[PDB]
């Protein structure tokens, strides 16, 4: 048994990094290790309450509580850094973060996980290079991602000066963001009779690669005309969101305090929720006929990692509807074959044949027995692919190598 310190130096954002950090903590504790979850409070975020953590998470102001921060990070055997300060923090924040890295006990094994994809996101970081150089173990979502192919080669140039050193780049291991899929099912799974087959619920946030435009399109072309309802949760307001109205796309927007105002009846525009509490969404999703996760990252960013919203759909008992090309570009953890090559119960949304996609949805909607068989397959498939029991063990073995 060891002491683990999970550190989110960017702060607790409430999305995938936070989710990963919490699932990571759960796995370590479940496996007999001691864990402290620490996050920089210097920068605040909108979804800090999306996940349950307040009863154990340890906030620290890097710019003003360096001593506190240092004592925390040096009180472990393994330090896991899941995020670094954002480009908008004050000098004291980033300066003290860099000082932390330099003063971490040399004997402590520092593990760095790069949870983001595009360079756009990656460059919005401060001190990532210094973090990578101190790391004893580095993880990324793809061998061909921007982190591996752009930043790493930039920090470790394949062409040195003259009086410097060649310094080979450190090894970067692939990883999948795990979730205790069994735990979610044991808490939210509903009997098929409790599910409203006419509800189509998309979950994510306002970033175009999450595929929200495709959901609006699918609602307009097939779901709305068929008398079905569409709900989209997690779309925060921002310049990207403003583009929706500018394009003339109809929708009704709500906050949690007005969720009871959502019109879930036929012939309505997409109903949008600005932000969601994870547990509340899982409850709503478990009673929804079909869940949608239409992320469409470029192939370079895809290896084996599905996202948490992908896993949540299968885990809570709805029928998962995923972006076809993503399934084609991802490989099954078990045998390394495309996710689409399996009879998984997952409906692979095809933008080039949405008619076929909706036909399958109507088929499952009309036969509760079939519906049940299909989601049991999806649950098992996703469990085999990315449950914490498998993935965190794989990562633990790599970390302790
Ligand atoms: O308003 C929101 C938006 C997202 N999430 C959760 O935050 C995580 C997001 O991780 P994912 O890997 O799906 O994508 P990311 O946000 O990290 O790119 C998932 O557990 C979502 O259910 C949430 O609880 N509330
Ligand atoms: Cl996050």
Q: Is 149 left (phi over 0), alpha (psi -120 to 50) or beta?
A: alpha
Q: Which of 345, 340, 380 is nearest to 363 (CA)?
A: 345
Residue 37 near residue 25, CB atoms below 8 Å: yes
Residue 14 tokens, joined: 């409430």
Q: How was this structure determined?
A: X-ray
Rounded distance between C-alpha atoms, residue 236 and residue 220, angstroms: 21
Rounded distance between C-alpha atoms, residue 323 and residue 382, angstroms: 15
Ligand 1, atom 18: closest residue by C-alpha: 16
Question: What is the whole-number distance in angstroms between the Cα of residue 354 and the centre of ligand 2?
Answer: 32
Residue 36 near residue 59, CB atoms below 8 Å: no
Q: Report the run of H or E that residue 271 belongs to, with start and end.
A: strand 270-273
Kindly report, as residue ranges, where domains of CATH 3.40.50.2000 are found in the chain.
1-177+388-401, 178-387
Q: The domain 1-177+388-401: what is its CATH number? A: 3.40.50.2000
279 close to ligand 1 (CB < 6 Angstrom): no
Continuous H helices in 74-127: 91-103, 119-122
Ligand 1, atom 25: closest residue by C-alpha: 276
Tell me the resolution in Å.
Answer: 1.7
Closest ligand to Cα 280 = 1
What strand order describes the sheet that includes 34-40? 58-60, 34-40, 3-8, 78-83, 109-113, 137-140, 172-174
Closest ligand 1 atom number to CA of residue 50: 24
Rounded distance between C-alpha atoms, residue 234 and residue 330, angstroms: 24
Axis crossing angle, helix 368-386 with helix 308-316, rounded to the nearest 10: 140
In the numeric block, the tokens 């330099």 are attached to 102
50 close to ligand 1 (CB < 6 Angstrom): yes
Question: What is the whole-number distance in angstroms between the Cα of residue 168 and the centre of ligand 1?
Answer: 35
Question: What is the whole-number distance in angstroms between the Cα of residue 309 and the centre of ligand 1?
Answer: 6
3-state class (DSSP) for residue 142: coil
297 close to ligand 1 (CB < 6 Angstrom): no
In 66-204, beta strands by DSSP E: 78-83, 109-113, 137-140, 172-174, 196-203
Homologous superfamily (CATH) of 178-387 is Glycogen Phosphorylase B; (3.40.50.2000)
């Amino acid at each position: 048994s060891m002491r683990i310190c999970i550190f989110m130096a960017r702060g607790l954002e409430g999305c995938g990094v936070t989710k990963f950090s919490l699932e990571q903590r759960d796995w370590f504790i479940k496996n007999g290790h001691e864990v402290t979850l620490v996050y920089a409070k210097d920068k605040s975020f909108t979804r800090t309450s999306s996940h349950d953590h307040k009863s154990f998470s340890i906030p620290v102001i890097l710019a003003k509580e360096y001593d506190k921060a240092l004592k925390l990070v040096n009180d472990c055997d393994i330090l896991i850094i899941n995020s670094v300060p954002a480009t908008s923090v004050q000098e004291a924040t980033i300066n003290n973060y860099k000082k932390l890295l330099d003063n971490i006990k040399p004997s402590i094994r520092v593990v760095v996980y790069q949870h983001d994809h595009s360079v756009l996101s990656l460059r919005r970081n401060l001190g990532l290079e210094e973090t990578v150089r101190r790391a004893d173990v580095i993880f990324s979502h793809s061998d061909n991602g921007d982190f591996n192919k752009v930043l790493m080669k930039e920090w470790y140039p394949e062409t040195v000066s003259l009086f410097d050193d060649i310094e080979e780049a450190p090894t970067v291991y692939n990883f999948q963001p795990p979730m205790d899929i069994v735990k979610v099912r044991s808490t939210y799974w509903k009997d098929v009779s409790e599910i409203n087959m006419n509800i189509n619920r998309w979950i994510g946030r306002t970033t175009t690669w999450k595929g929200f435009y495709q959901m609006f399109d699918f609602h307009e072309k097939f779901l709305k005309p068929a008398g079905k309802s569409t709900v989209m949760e997690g779309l925060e307001r921002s310049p990207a969101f403003i583009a929706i109205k500018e394009k003339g796309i109809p929708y009704e927007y709500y906050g949690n305090r007005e969720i009871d105002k959502m019109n879930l009846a036929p012939n309505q525009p997409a109903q949008i929720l600005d932000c969601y509490i994870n547990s509340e969404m899982l409850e709503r999703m478990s009673k929804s006929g079909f869940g949608y996760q239409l992320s469409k990252l470029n192939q370079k960013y895809l290896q084996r990692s599905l996202e948490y919203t992908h896993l949540e759909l299968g885990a809570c008992g709805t029928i998962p509807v995923f972006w076809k090309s993503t399934g084609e570009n991802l490989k099954f953890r078990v045998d390394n074959t495309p996710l689409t090559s399996h009879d998984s119960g997952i409906i692979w949304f095809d933008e080039n044949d949405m008619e076929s996609t909706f036909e399958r949805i109507k088929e499952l909607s009309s036969d509760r027995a079939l519906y049940d068989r299909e989601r049991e397959k999806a649950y098992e498939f996703l469990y085999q692919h990315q449950d914490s029991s498998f993935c965190f063990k794989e990562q633990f073995d790599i970390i302790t190598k």
